[PDB]
């Protein structure tokens, strides 16, 4: 019948949502298998066959037929078919007139034949480049696109989307936006281990496997290890996270593995989730299965890939720890399961010491099973609330499956989106950028080149509080500028920020007069001592908006040559926007004559062959790869430069200029504008849905739980477009990626640095900026400053005005607008319109209750990217730097930090606030100055305890040696991932801290053992006292706490010029000199 | 101030039970015939429930890792005077409490009403390859009290497939 | 098996006495929660006798050796517990979201008795300091 997608219901075959896709070889012909959770059905796969292809480029378009005959005859052993095609190439002169590069499409039966054609062509390209129809072959193009990605782009098939599978291909539905519910399993495993070691799958057994399936809980137990039969129980850590656990008490480890594989086959999960199971759980199960003679691939379809990650065909492996590392925005100290559960699910999971797990299998197996089901519940609800909606939403737009969409770096996700858009516009993809092995600047070898990135300033240090007074010295001339700008800044807030007309605003002159009065009073009374308003002003999506405003892509940065070759280059040309950037070289002080002397010296040396099963053991310098030659040159240049010039590097900053074409084909920037608008769309839809979730009735179960999941969904597509945009912003410096643009990146950063310095220079004249980081300014304004207002429309709707924000946005629009933006109005006649583009807006966050900024121990130097901020309710809004939130560290400092942060909300003045904070500092100093003789001994232990985890012990450990390394070796002498719990001992005196690290487990050991090891570790054969207090280095712990007190409090107040509130912790000698020279 | 003392031996009969607002209303009702009763089917296996005159809750003990001491006020049999140590902010003693119990758990109450999924779905799909809906709903009620959408209950093993107006269930 | 909760006495006492005013109920009850393990001696009768008379830190009351383990000073919502000679705990009086209830299982007569209902608790969440 006639194919029309409008009559889809008459269209034949089967409709389904594509959940999983993989490349296959069919009876071999290359194809992609597509797995449809499908609607209605439990599932079904279908296959699309498609010829793998790539292009040849020619240097002379008049002789393409001579190249065609050559390649037909040269590739006859592997080529399926050949076709001449045309594509837009944005590097071709005058492509903006519809000139297209002529290309030879080579098509193959499968990806292996495509790879042989590449092996045959690469020698010709290497001969042509170093040294006839062979010399007409310029390059090969698009030869490195993954085959499933090719089929997904060329057929527009996307996971997360719904399709009807038909003879002609896949047709995207449009009526079904909600996902299907796949069967989701999530599991965790408990293993035996030796004391103070990591588990080894060669000798250690699986004790238990905990899992959840769709909200039901299960536990399998190995009764060789677990001492009692565990009964069915409930672990519900909140009413929104049910966990009913059915228990399978299996006789041995092989029955446990067989039950686990059987239950996977019965429920047919299309998602399996784990926490770090790519690197622990699946490796362990697979090695134990192999010891018992089970093949886990023939049992459940799971195998390790080329990266060593565990994958199947039908089922996607959703390791939650991949999303935690990439997307969760959690700092690396909060990326372990407990800290993720606390920060995302908002409860404390059960916590067991890894050294107690193997004992508790015999002594307390019920409490071990409660711990194991807690980590399955934590993993399942982490997956379902965060990872599931985020990854499947990304798949609806990215031409990748869930496993790749979870695991690839964000700059590769940008590459795939740009490849979709370039393909849809018939653009030819560039080959991947290869960094030059060496570069020179003024005859010096470059070690590295880059640009000046984001601008960052620490201007003030101190405690700032909404209830404590601050001095302000307003510049009267800044208020005169603001009074002169006020009419157009208010008009701009109606017309541009709120997208309305001034004629609809009933109270425009009322708001103008109210702001004018406050400004005049601040002009006349320009020196004030009043309460602050603590504000953050930050540029919405700064780098993306600079990129869209200036039409910045790597498709435009043109040289003077390409601009001179362009037929749009006339007298009067407006389309050549010139922008500045700051290049930064790091080079060796050595010159080209000295480089050549080092090269000639290395030519007389002999080198080991990186060859293995090969033979020739020794190479000359010129027989090395050029990359290896340069590695050896750089090594001898570092020694020579240090010997002759007394420095290894020089760094230089050069301001450069580049030409941004406005007439160049719009595909990059259209992707950014369009993506920005779709995200805004979903923020809007989100708000409409928020209204829908509250407008209606309260019978929660009345077929409106579908409405709330879709709210999560649009939020998720919002967050998804968000990550994609901020990524485009990064991708563009993705070394090795395509569409790379080191320049463009420098313009984006220097333009941003200029915007934020312009904003700071106004805020410094009307208030006090405290910290500046890239796109954000933290400041205090006078409490009398013009703040928030509402314009009233004739229809009774209110528009929002923040005057501190709109005064900056107006000045951004008068200084950084692109009046040269060109857009293609008529594609048949190549007619361009010129308009004024600018999308760069500050947003405002606050007002805040308190902000705390630390100072350096160095004179005149602030500490950047470190602060604590509090909301009006006294909750901790935002933090910077700091510890505690970290894995391990010294427990004393974590407990001190837990106490201190809430106390910055106390006191009515900045001195009063620092005095309340100083009370707590003195209490924590008393515990140390009293040698902690107080409290209980075990408690002293824990607090004093410092914990550190070793990555992989083994040979990395035969390797370096230090405190943990010393603790791990001392645990080995006494009893990957090992938790080195230790204290620092006073003896031996004058010994390095790394040799004074004693494992805490010695204090709980038998008196003879404790005595022998403490004597050996302190180097005191006469040690008879074994009290922990006489072993501890109280001076070391007092310096550690004193250094926390200096960084978090003494500095703030003393840096702001307030007397030192904790006198028992002195200031550094530079800061004492800086205060004395400030008071003189 | 109140002096806090501890006995050498605690009574383990004292246990902590969470009292919800509804439980409080029930507790403050002298009208009831039977106020509350602990019930169990047997001594060693079955669950224990708490019952009012018209409602039933199942009990769940929840252990915690803290030391929880309950103190009751007591009148010392003989006048006892304690020495003053370097303790600051101490008012005259007026009564005396003793920690008499050390509890490690609470008793939570959840309202409750006073077989293999895959196999049952297999047998359901057997007798009839394609099933209706209102026909299949009372047949699947028994598998998961999770309160779910009936379609999800079916999708635990069998699968739905639609057409013009009817939706049948196959595999 | 089955057994009733006897709550008549507590109920009658509750209706006939005023509403709970402070943290301590009119019947004289208090709970206490500590993030840790209270390390106490394993024996008491022998050790209660060597305590000097002036301290009275280990007293004897009605044939039972009670240890005087601390002092409590309540200042509004703030509360401080002094333990021994070397411990000071800072905490707060918090109103219970779920009013706790203490009961009593008389195994002898198979009777259960409601002892009391709480509404407040004294919590200490910070590491103990010396008494100064």
């Amino acid at each position: 019948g006639r194919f029309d997608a409008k009559d889809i219901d008459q269209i034949p075959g089967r409709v389904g949502w594509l959940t999983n896709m993989h490349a296959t070889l069919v009876s071999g012909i290359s194809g992609v298998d597509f797995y449809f959770l499908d609607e209605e059905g439990g599932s079904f796969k279908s296959t699309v066959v498609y010829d793998p292809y790539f292009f040849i480029a020619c240097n002379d378009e008049s002789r393409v037929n001579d190249v065609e005959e050559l390649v037909k005859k040269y590739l006859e052993s592997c080529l399926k078919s050949l076709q001449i095609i045309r594509k837009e190439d944005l590097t071709m002169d005058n492509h903006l007139l519809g000139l297209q590069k002529t290309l030879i499409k080579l098509s193959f039966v499968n990806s292996n034949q495509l790879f042989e054609a590449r092996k045959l062509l690469r020698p010709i390209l290497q001969d042509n480049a170093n040294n006839d129809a062979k010399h007409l072959i310029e390059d090969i193009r698009e030869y490195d696109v993954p085959y499933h990605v090719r089929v997904s782009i060329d057929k527009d098939i996307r996971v997360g989307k719904w399709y009807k599978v038909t003879q002609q291909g896949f047709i995207e539905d449009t009526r079904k936006i909600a996902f299907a519910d796949p069967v989701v399993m999530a599991f965790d495993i408990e293993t035996t281990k030796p004391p103070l070691k990591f588990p080894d799958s060669a000798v250690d057994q699986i004790m238990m496997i905990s899992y959840m399936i769709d909200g039901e809980g299960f536990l399998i137990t190995n009764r060789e290890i677990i001492s009692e039969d565990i009964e069915d129980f409930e672990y519900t850590p909140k009413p929104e996270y049910p966990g009913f656990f059915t228990i399978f008490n299996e006789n041995d480890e092989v029955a446990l593995l067989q039950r686990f594989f059987e239950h996977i086959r019965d429920v047919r999960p299309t998602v399996i989730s784990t926490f770090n199971g790519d690197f622990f759980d699946w490796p362990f199960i697979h090695n134990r299965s192999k010891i018992h003679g089970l093949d886990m691939f023939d049992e459940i379809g799971f195998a390790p890939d080329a990266e060593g990650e565990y994958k199947s065909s039908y089922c996607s492996h959703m390791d939650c720890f991949r999303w935690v590392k990439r997307d969760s925005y959690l700092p690396q100290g909060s990326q372990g399961l407990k800290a993720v559960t606390q920060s995302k699910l908002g409860y404390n999971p059960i916590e067991l010491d890894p050294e107690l797990m193997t004992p508790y299998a015999f002594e307390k197996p019920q409490h071990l099973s409660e711990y194991s089901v807690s980590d399955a519940v934590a993993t399942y609800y982490l997956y379902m609330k965060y990872v599931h909606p985020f990854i499947f939403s990304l798949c609806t737009i990215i031409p990748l499956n869930p496993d790749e969409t979870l695991r690839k770096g964000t700059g590769t996700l940008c590459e795939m989106l740009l490849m979709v858009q370039a393909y849809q516009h018939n653009i030819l993809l560039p080959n991947k950028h290869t960094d030059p092995i060496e570069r020179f600047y003024d005859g010096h070898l470059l070690e590295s080149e880059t640009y000046v990135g984001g601008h960052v300033e620490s201007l003030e240090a101190g405690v700032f509080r909404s209830d404590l007074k601050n001095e302000f010295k307003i510049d009267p001339s800044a208020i005169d500028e603001l009074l002169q700008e006020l009419p157009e800044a208010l008009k701009f807030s109606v017309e541009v920020e709120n997208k309305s007309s001034v004629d609809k605003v009933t109270n425009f002159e009322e708001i103008k007069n109210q702001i004018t009065q406050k400004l005049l009073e601040l002009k006349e009374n320009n020196i004030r001592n009043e309460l602050p308003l603590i504000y953050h002003v930050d540029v919405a999506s700064m780098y993306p908006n600079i990129m869209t405003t200036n039409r910045l892509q790597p498709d435009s940065i043109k040289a003077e040559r390409d601009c001179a070759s362009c037929d749009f280059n006339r007298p009067g040309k407006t389309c050549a926007r010139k922008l500045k950037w700051a290049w930064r070289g790091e080079f060796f002080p050595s010159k080209m004559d000295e480089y050549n002397m080092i090269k000639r010296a290395l030519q007389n040396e002999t080198f080991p062959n990186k060859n293995k099963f090969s033979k020739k053991k020794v190479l000359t310098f010129d027989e090395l790869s050029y990359a290896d030659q340069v590695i050896h040159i750089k090594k001898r240049l570092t020694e020579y430069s240090r010997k002759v010039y007394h420095r290894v590097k020089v760094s230089e900053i050069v301001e450069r200029e580049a030409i941004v074409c406005q007439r160049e084909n719009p595909f990059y920037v259209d992707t950014v504008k369009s993506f920005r608008d779709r995200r805004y769309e979903f923020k809007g839809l989100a708000k409409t849905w928020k209204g829908n979730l509250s407008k209606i009735d309260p019978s929660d179960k009345h077929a409106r739980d579908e409405a709330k999941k879709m709210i999560v969904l649009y939020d998720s597509l919002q967050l998804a477009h968000k990550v994609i945009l901020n990524s485009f912003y990064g991708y563009v410096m993705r070394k090795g990626s395509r569409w790379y643009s080191m320049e463009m990146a420098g313009i984006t950063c220097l333009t941003g640095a200029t915007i934020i310095q312009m904003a700071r220079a106004l805020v410094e004249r009307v208030g006090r900026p405290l910290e500046l980081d890239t796109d954000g300014i933290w400041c205090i304004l006078p409490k009398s400053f013009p703040e928030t207002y509402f314009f009233t429309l004739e229809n009774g709707k209110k528009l929002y005005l923040s005057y501190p924000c709109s005064m900056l946005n107006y000045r951004v629009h008068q200084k950084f607008t692109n009046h040269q933006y060109q857009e293609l109005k008529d594609p048949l006649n190549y007619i361009y319109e010129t308009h004024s583009e600018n999308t760069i807006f500050f947003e405002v966050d606050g007002p805040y209750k308190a902000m705390i900024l630390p100072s350096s121990k160095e004179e005149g130097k602030g500490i950047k990217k470190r602060y604590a901020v509090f909301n009006e309710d006294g909750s901790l809004a935002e933090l910077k730097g700091f510890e505690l939130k970290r894995r391990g560290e010294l427990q004393l400092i974590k407990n001190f930090q837990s106490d201190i942060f809430k106390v910055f909300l106390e006191g009515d003045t900045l001195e009063g606030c620092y005095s309340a904070v100083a009370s707590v500092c003195n209490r924590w100093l008393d515990v140390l100055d009293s040698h902690g003789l107080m409290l209980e001994d075990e408690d002293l232990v824990s607090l004093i305890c410092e914990n550190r985890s070793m990555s992989k012990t083994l040979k990395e450990y035969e390797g370096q040696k230090s405190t943990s390394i010393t603790t791990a070796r001392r645990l080995g002498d006494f009893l990957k991932g090992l938790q080195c719990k230790y204290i620092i001992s006073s003896k031996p005196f004058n010994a390095p801290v790394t040799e004074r690290a004693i494992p805490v487990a010695i204090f709980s050991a038998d008196i003879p053992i404790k005595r022998s090891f403490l004597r050996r570790w302190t180097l005191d054969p006469s040690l008879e006292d074994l009290d922990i207090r006489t072993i501890i280095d109280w001076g070391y712990y007092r310096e550690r706490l004193g250094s926390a007190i200096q960084k978090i409090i003494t500095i703030p107040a003393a840096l702001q010029g307030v007397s030192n509130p904790v006198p028992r912790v002195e200031h550094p000698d530079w800061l004492k000199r800086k205060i004395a020279t400030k008071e003189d | 101030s109140i002096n806090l003392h501890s006995a050498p031996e605690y009574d383990p009969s004292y246990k902590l039970i969470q009292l919800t607002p509804e439980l409080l209303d029930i507790i403050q009702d002298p009208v009831q015939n039977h106020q509350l009763r602990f019930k169990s089917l047997d001594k060693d296996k079955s669950e224990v429930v708490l019952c009012s005159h018209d409602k039933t809750w199942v009990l769940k003990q929840r252990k915690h890792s803290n030391t929880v001491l309950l103190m009751r006020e007591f009148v010392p049999e003989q006048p006892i005077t304690f020495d003053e140590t370097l303790l600051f902010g101490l008012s005259k003693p007026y009564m005396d409490v003793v920690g008499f119990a050390k509890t490690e758990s609470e008793f939570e109450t959840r309202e409750t009403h006073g077989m293999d999924p895959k196999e049952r779905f297999k047998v359901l799909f057997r007798l009839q390859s394609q099933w209706d809906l209102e026909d299949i709903k009372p047949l699947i009620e028994e598998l998961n009290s999770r309160g779910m959408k009936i379609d999800s209950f079916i999708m635990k093993y069998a699968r739905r497939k639609r057409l013009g107006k009817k939706t049948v269930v196959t595999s | 098996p089955s057994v009733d909760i006897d709550a008549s006495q507590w109920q009658k006492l509750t209706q006939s006495r005023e509403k709970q005013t402070t943290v301590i109920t009119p019947l004289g009850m208090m709970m206490l929660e500590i993030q840790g393990e209270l390390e106490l001696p394993k024996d008491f009768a022998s050790l209660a006798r060597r305590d000097s008379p002036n301290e009275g830190r280990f007293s004897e009351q009605d044939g039972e050796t009670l240890i005087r383990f601390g002092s409590l000073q309540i200042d509004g919502e703030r509360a401080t517990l002094f333990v021994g000679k070397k411990q000071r705990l800072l905490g707060k009086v918090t109103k219970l979201d779920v009013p706790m209830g203490i009961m009593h299982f008389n195994s002898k007569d198979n009777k259960v008795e409601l002892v009391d209902v709480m509404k407040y608790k004294v919590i200490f969440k910070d590491r103990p300091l010396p008494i100064m």
């Binding site: 409930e234 404390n348 001994d937 | 047997d42 758990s105 | 840790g36 070397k86």
Partner: peptide
């Protein structure tokens, strides 16, 4: 005589809910 103290737990932990048997009470 001065050997009474609290061994401080670094963080508050609440354990898993457990079923109750008749023997759990007595």
């Amino acid at each position: 005589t001065v050997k009474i103290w609290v061994k401080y737990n670094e963080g508050f932990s609440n354990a898993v809910r457990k079923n109750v048997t008749w023997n759990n009470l007595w």
